[PDB]
Amino acid sequence: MTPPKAEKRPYPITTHGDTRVDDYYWLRDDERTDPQVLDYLQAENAFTDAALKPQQALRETLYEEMVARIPQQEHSVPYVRHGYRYQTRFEPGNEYAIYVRQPQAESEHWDTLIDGNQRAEQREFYTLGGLEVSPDNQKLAVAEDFLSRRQYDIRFKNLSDDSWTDEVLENTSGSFEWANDSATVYYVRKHAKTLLPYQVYRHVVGTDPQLDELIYEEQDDTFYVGLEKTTSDRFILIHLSSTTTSEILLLDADRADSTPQMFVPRRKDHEYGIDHYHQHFYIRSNKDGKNFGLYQSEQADEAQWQTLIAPRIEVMLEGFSLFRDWLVVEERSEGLTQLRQIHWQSGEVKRIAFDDPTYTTWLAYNPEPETELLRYGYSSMTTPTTLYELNLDSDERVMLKQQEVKNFTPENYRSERVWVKARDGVEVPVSLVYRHDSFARGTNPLMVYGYGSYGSSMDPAFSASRLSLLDRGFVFVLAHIRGGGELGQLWYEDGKLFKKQNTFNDFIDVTEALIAQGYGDAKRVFAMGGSAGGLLMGAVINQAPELFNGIVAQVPFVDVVTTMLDESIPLTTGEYDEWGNPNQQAYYDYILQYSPYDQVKAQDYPHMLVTTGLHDSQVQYWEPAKWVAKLRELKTDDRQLLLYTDMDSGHGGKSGRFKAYEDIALEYAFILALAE
Ligand SMILES: *CC(=O)[C@H](CCCCN)NS(=O)(=O)c1ccc(C)cc1
């Protein structure tokens, strides 16, 4: 009964002589210090509560259904690192993992490093960003988010007696490494207002952080500061990264007074990363090709890099792991992840087959290089997430664990890789899955999912929650659209900057091909995207509103032009080589044509559920809030338009193994009611 009507306070923004009027600009508050804002967000939540009350039963049915799939007890396969065996445990009803370990010689008794349920201690949000035991096995460092804004606290535990030290490192990125003395930690501090990771500090454990020494400050705010430690343990790396360009600095992990030593000075459009092992640096670099190569060197000097793997236009080299006798690399070709092993001596090459049309494989955690046992991951649209161990020499493979899914028989579902020819003749890969026994050409609701930014890939993986749609006749689709990484670096570059419109075109083209070929019911087409996938949702409903019956747009990036004009707002300065720099006229004009907030107009929009989190640090809460306000004022349809603001979460929604399914049940009930 009557949606809330945002206050209008005309706010002009002038760039290149173009004045845009933002009536809803006031919805932005930089602390949360304006009662007017909360009142709007609270009123939208009350309208959403009232409007979705009918589905109360169906939500609790789906919640209960999704929870019923999950083993209540869930134990990881143990591993051994520096004389200790480690395991991660959920016990019945637990929202968060318990991390335990024991001496390698021991079997009966395990010690608790940390209990997430104890640490979460009543709070609506908790994330362990990282935990790591000192090289001397005496101390534990943990990075925890208590709020959901990804401002990680770092704290330290004495493992001998399970006491905590007095100090906390605040507003960190959660990225840290131990010096080899186990007394010092290096860690990354975030800018107080932009939240950009920009400073490395040295901290002596057990001391006041006011005494922490600044080691490196990144002067160019288009870059991110991270920390890594090499396989050799000789170096802690300052990894400075941006869209286009890398630089690594070495810190001697064996010394207390290390200062950053330059590896290779930054060069525009040269991305590199390194490890150190067997006395050599191993470099993944795009110096000679966009799809990257792998290089070995005794020295930093780029002229000395020996080619191990030459860049191939057909193969994206993505990642690598170093063993005693084998190099193992993660590669992508024909839209599919593979792993390849190369013997350092014989140069013999072996590849890991998978015949599934619709899977992902990856290097899992391998704590020790001195072994012939590779642990690697596998998941598909039809096979739950699996941990394999491969003997690299004998080829024998053992399945260590497959995720148990209750109330599920894989033989009931089938998946396909389909190729869709886009409006410009370019072939776009699609992964889809459905329940065979309920499938009939032309009759099944479609759920089409896209992201398509940053060269991130929507790799086909198993979802247990997704069975709630598959078991009600849905065909679930991953559209591997340009801007994503699915076909290598050129696929990414062909969907950003002056090519970003290809992301949106590709998603429409895939959706129309699928309806034309009878995979979906033309009246029951749903789409979902989050964050950069929310940009996708926003652009496609402006451009092709009548295509979709209903839309879920999570933490959506929609105020593109205003956001990219403002260096004060988190992530802006790091994304000029993604969308463009709208201080430049060409970029301003190109981006304005798709910026969803700016292109809302008087037309019929599909049914829409917009979700955000008040603390969201990547897409600030006001973008979706403004976008809903402006949609409510101008839309000509009277279809559902709901805003759900979670007051106690951020970019990744509700924390907790079971709690997360509250958001998915709400989303899926909204879609299922429209598919009745
Ligand atoms: C969650 C998401 O897609 C957001 C959108 C942020 C838009 C900022 N104006 N991106 S992110 O911050 O999570 C992010 C994810 C991957 C990469 C490579 C960069 C940023």
The two tokens of residue 593 are: 């044509």
Name beta bridge partners: 103. Answer: 84
Q: Domain locations in the chain? A: 40-64+410-674, 312-404
Q: Where are the alpha helices (DSSP H) in 480-529?
A: 489-493, 501-516
Residue 492, by phi and psi: left (phi above 0), alpha (psi -120 to 50) or beta?
alpha
First to last CA, the chain: 22
The two tokens of residue 298 are: 């005794």
The 3-state secondary structure of 299-352 reads CCCHHHCEEEECCECCEEEEEEEECCCEEEEEEEECCEEEEEEEECCCCCEEEC
**Distance in angstroms (rounded) separating the CA atoms of residues 95 and 112:** 17
Torsion over CA of 190, 196, 197 and 202, rounded to 10 degrees? -40
The 3-state secondary structure of 582-606 reads CCCHHHHHHHHCCCHHHHCCCCCCC
What are the DSSP calls for 406-434, one per residue? TT--GGGEEEEEEEEE-TTS-EEEEEEEE
With a 6 A CB cut-off, is 563 part of the ligand 1 pocket? yes
Which one-letter amino acid corresponds to residue 57?
Answer: A
Residue in the block written with tokens 């131990």 = 178
Residue in the block written with tokens 């000192």 = 134
Torsion over CA of 430, 435, 438 and 441, rounded to 10 degrees? 20
Name beta bridge partners: 213. Answer: 202
Quick count: other Cβ atoms within 10 Å of Cβ 628? 28
**Distance in angstroms (rounded) separating the CA atoms of residues 153 and 182:** 19
The two tokens of residue 155 are: 């704290």
CB-based burial, 395-415: b 16+ in 10 Å, e otherwise:
eeeeeeeebebeeeeeeebbb
**Distance in angstroms (rounded) separating the CA atoms of residues 104 and 287:** 43
CA-based nearest residue to 597, from 654, 534, 639, 549: 534
Quick count: other Cβ atoms within 10 Å of Cβ 603? 13
Dihedral sign (CA 668, 670, 675, 676): positive
Name beta bridge partners: 421. Answer: 427
Tell how strand 184-190 and strand 197-204 pair up.
antiparallel
Residue 541 belongs to what H/E stretch?
Answer: helix 532-543
Residue 150 belongs to what H/E stretch?
Answer: none
- Annotated catalytic, 616? yes
**Distance in angstroms (rounded) separating the CA atoms of residues 454 and 461:** 19
Class of the CATH domain delimited by 40-64+410-674 = alpha beta
With a 6 A CB cut-off, is 519 part of the ligand 1 pocket? no
C-alpha angle 53-55-58 in degrees, rounded to nearest 5: 140
Measured in Å, residue 613 CA sits from the centre of ligand 1 at 15
**Is the CB of residue 610 less than 8 Å from the CB of residue 559?**
no
Q: 381 to each of 341, 410, 459, how far by Cα in Å?
A: 26, 10, 10
Instruction: Identify the residue whose C-alpha is closest to ligand 1 atom 12.
Output: 618
Mutation test of ligand 1: which of 127, 196, 618 has the most ligand atoms closer than 8 Å to its C-beta? Answer: 618
Dihedral sign (CA 16, 495, 469, 65): negative
**Distance in angstroms (rounded) separating the CA atoms of residues 670 and 59:** 9
Task: Name the 3-class secondary structure at 539.
Answer: helix
CA-based nearest residue to 600, from 652, 650, 640, 560: 560
Q: 86 to each of 98, 596, 657, how far by Cα in Å?
A: 11, 47, 20
With a 6 A CB cut-off, is 557 part of the ligand 1 pocket? yes
Resolution in A: 2.2
Q: 148 to each of 145, 536, 614, how far by Cα in Å?
A: 6, 24, 9
Q: Is 250 exposed, middle or buried (0-12, 13-18, 19+ CB in 10 A)?
A: buried
| Phi, psi torsion values for 668, nearest 5 degrees | -65, -35
Name the structure determination technique.
Answer: X-ray
